[PDB]
Chains A and B, each alone.
With several copies, the nearest count.
Chain A
């Protein structure tokens, strides 16, 4: 919930860094709640109110004690409003769905009421089709300026990625962001685990006229270095030896500093320039002896920062 609220507060178009520098096109956030309790509802209301984001938002809120059919109808209403705004008034709409787990539970209840054929864990056999009919309404239409972006937050039951809910959602959506319970145990916020995370549409949204020319290379190098650090530290618990090659100890330090500075950012609204700067500063590895998975010459332009913050 905190991540959803923070994204709703901080998400902005950033049109200046785009090639087509202009005044901001209208941006709105449609927030849909499904099976939400009073406490989380109060949290969301206060979070939207204290920052002025409530002005550019339409909230569809469905409490836990509401009829079980309102949970079914809430995402439909939210997406209908978002589609209308985007494709008839050029609004750039970001849609946040509070908990699709509650929606799937309500759908299971309705299906069991109708006595249909069950699925993997009692869910109706058409759950994929219904979730697709919700999710697929996002996108951009040729010849129109508006856009619809969806961030469905859902809870993995027992952190099981093979559960029907996350499985079908991943089958329908383009990538996913995964929260790590261990990173939460270490006090890191947001506890986003980059190794099991993926964005299918990332590769064509970064580059020249979009973010910065070093974005893709930096992301690839960060993934390579963090994976190397994670695998070294996972082997150390097996070998049980802190004594190893000198280069491995560089990555362990890099991995720890990464998890403590890049991922652990609290409530900071880091700009993409600031995030890239922090990535570059964390890039304390060898300019050539390391950082070789992606061949880039932006090293001579950006490398050499000394972990300085603010």
Chain B
């Protein structure tokens, strides 16, 4: 697989032998992620939420008919130590996938 986050997180994932890329701005991360997708060897790409909050804007350009290199956002370690907004994430997901804000 591969993780595209800050260089500290990328190195930490390299500690597991996983591909990592250190990017601080969204456009550089998206550009390198396009090359990673073009490589296509890895079956999963994890991108920092603080780097690409919506990687859906960049997944669809390539892998148009194929979805093997599935990708999901993950919270960057810098804010992961602080905490992650799980419930708001799930609510925005159900809004993006249904569109009625039906919770509780």
- The answer, yes or no, to whether B99 is at the interface (CB within 8 Å) is yes
List residues of chain B with CB within 8 A of the CB of A241.
99
Interface residues in B69-104 by Cβ distance below 8 A to A read 99
A241 to B99, CA, bound (A): 8
List residues of chain B with CB within 8 A of the CB of A240.
99
A241 to B97, CA, bound (A): 10
- The answer, yes or no, to whether A22 is at the interface (CB within 8 Å) is no
List residues of chain A with CB within 8 A of the CB of B99.
240-242
A241 to B98, CA, bound (A): 9
Q: Number of contacts between A and B (CB, 8 Å)?
A: 3
Output the nearest chain A residue to B98 by Cβ-Cβ distance: A240
Q: Mark A217-256, 1 if CB is under 8 A from B, else 0.
A: 0000000000000000000000011100000000000000
Nearest Cβ on chain A to B94's Cβ, whole angstroms: 14
Tally of A interface residues using CB under 8 Å: 3
A242 to B65, CA, bound (A): 10
A242 to B99, CA, bound (A): 8
Nearest Cβ on chain B to A175's Cβ, whole angstroms: 40
Interface residues in A68-86 by Cβ distance below 8 A to B read none
List residues of chain B with CB within 8 A of the CB of A242.
99
A240 to B99, CA, bound (A): 9
Q: Mark B27-66, 1 if CB is under 8 A from A, else 0.
A: 0000000000000000000000000000000000000000
Nearest Cβ on chain B to A244's Cβ, whole angstroms: 12
Output the nearest chain B residue to A240 by Cβ-Cβ distance: B99
A240 to B95, CA, bound (A): 12
Nearest Cβ on chain A to B54's Cβ, whole angstroms: 11
Output the nearest chain B residue to A242 by Cβ-Cβ distance: B99
A290 to B99, CA, bound (A): 29
A242 to B100, CA, bound (A): 11
A303 to B13, CA, bound (A): 58
Nearest Cβ on chain A to B103's Cβ, whole angstroms: 17
Output the nearest chain A residue to B96 by Cβ-Cβ distance: A243
Interface residues in A273-306 by Cβ distance below 8 A to B read none
A242 to B98, CA, bound (A): 11
A171 to B99, CA, bound (A): 46
Nearest Cβ on chain A to B73's Cβ, whole angstroms: 17
Nearest Cβ on chain B to A246's Cβ, whole angstroms: 15
Output the nearest chain B residue to A241 by Cβ-Cβ distance: B99
Nearest Cβ on chain B to A245's Cβ, whole angstroms: 14
Nearest Cβ on chain A to B16's Cβ, whole angstroms: 36
Nearest Cβ on chain A to B22's Cβ, whole angstroms: 31
A240 to B100, CA, bound (A): 11
A262 to B99, CA, bound (A): 30
Nearest Cβ on chain A to B79's Cβ, whole angstroms: 25
Output the nearest chain A residue to B65 by Cβ-Cβ distance: A242
Closest 3 CB pairs of A and B: A242-B99, A240-B99, A241-B99
A-side residues, CB < 8 A to B, are 240-242
A–B Cβ pairs within 8 angstroms, 3 of them: A240-B99, A241-B99, A242-B99
B-side residues, CB < 8 A to A, are 99
